[PDB]
């Protein structure tokens, strides 16, 4: 059962992300979990939880109300994840540049807030796109979803470019390599998805399957490795 199978992936993905958040809380006293890196991993893990919960709405009896609310939750959750990934790159860029120059001291609060505010602007611009597309019509129309996915592709290009430059500044930085590899995979997944939605009669399931795979990629390549690096 394709739909039974999607519901199973969503619940398993949800449980893995919750284990991640429990890991960060049980380690709240440690400095890395309190800092910006830990909070961004939490945000990504929370975004994965929300994506999984929203997919479960899709796999219900179809209705204009639930499906559209489900599409907005998927869109806003990916908006959170891409913004958290962006802020993570921005904070690590400042960390690496400083520690290379010297000043082992952690990045200043102003540097951190500057990165948080840039990520936040990306999150707000997506919300404005969502609100304007919705007045044009419901997101249950394929063209409207494609408009949101193309915007995700734009943000993902920005992440890729920025992760490329961290990897040039710090060639041996595993977090930058993982974000770069995850961002490249998400771009391939979302481009193939834009191709398919036009010709797919059951496009909600195709969208459901793709966002689960994309969220699984965030968990497997970004979240879980960074946590395991701190256990050891």
Numbering used by the authors: 1 to 232
Provide the publication's sentences verbatim.
Here we use a robust deep learning pipeline to design complex folds and soluble analogues of integral membrane proteins. Unique membrane topologies, such as those from G-protein-coupled receptors, are not found in the soluble proteome, and we demonstrate that their structural features can be recapitulated in solution. Biophysical analyses demonstrate the high thermal stability of the designs, and experimental structures show remarkable design accuracy. The soluble analogues were functionalized with native structural motifs, as a proof of concept for bringing membrane protein functions to the soluble proteome, potentially enabling new approaches in drug discovery.
Then, we tested our design approach in one of the most prevalent membrane folds in nature: the GPCR fold. The core topology of GPCRs comprises seven transmembrane helices that facilitate numerous non-local interactions, enabling them to bind to a variety of ligands, including photoreceptors, odours, pheromones, hormones and neurotransmitters. Of these ten designs, nine were monodisperse monomers in solution, and all showed the characteristic circular dichroism signature of α-helix-rich proteins. All ten designs also showed high thermal stabilities (Tm > 90 °C). Last, the designed GLFs preserved the canonical seven-helical bundle characteristic of native GPCRs. This accuracy further extended to the side-chain level, for which comparisons of crystal structures versus design models for GLF_18 and GLF_32 showed 1.54 and 1.40 Å r.m.s.d.fa values, respectively. At the structural level, we observed that the irregular local structure of the terminal helix was preserved, whereas the intracellular segment of the GPCR fold exhibited notable structural deviation in GLF_18.
